[PDB]
Amino acid sequence: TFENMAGVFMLVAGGIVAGIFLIFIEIAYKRHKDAR
Amino acid sequence: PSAFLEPFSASVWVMMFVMLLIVSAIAVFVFEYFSP
């Protein structure tokens, strides 16, 4: 109804969008290490 | 009372419909970008 749920929505959205970006490179490095 | 409508929750009712669209779009974009 107001910002009460919007705050947690913004928090989780920022968390997931940061996590995917910071973990794509980690997944690529893991794949490269497994397939050197 | 109207269940799952603006009076029930999210009285703005004109933001989540585009929020889901934009988060789906960014998820698709990152999935495409992380393919290689």
Contact status, residue B13 vs residue B6, Cβ threshold 8 Å: yes
Q: Determination technique for this PDB entry?
A: cryo-EM
**Inter-chain touch B34–A27, beta carbons under 8 Å:** yes
What is the distance between the alpha carbons of residues B26 and B3, in angstroms, rounded to a whole number?
30
A contact set with B (CB within 8 A): 1-2, 5, 9, 13, 17, 20-21, 24, 27-28
Quote the CA–CA distance of B26 and B29 in Å, as a whole number.
5
**Smallest Cα distance from B3 to chain A, Å:** 13
Label each residue of chain A as H, E or C: CCHHHHHHHHHHHHHHHHHHHHHHHHHHHHHHHHCC
Task: Give resolution, Å, one decimal.
Answer: 3.8
Provide, as residue numbers in chain A, all residues whose Cβ is less than 8 Å from the Cβ of B17. Answer: none
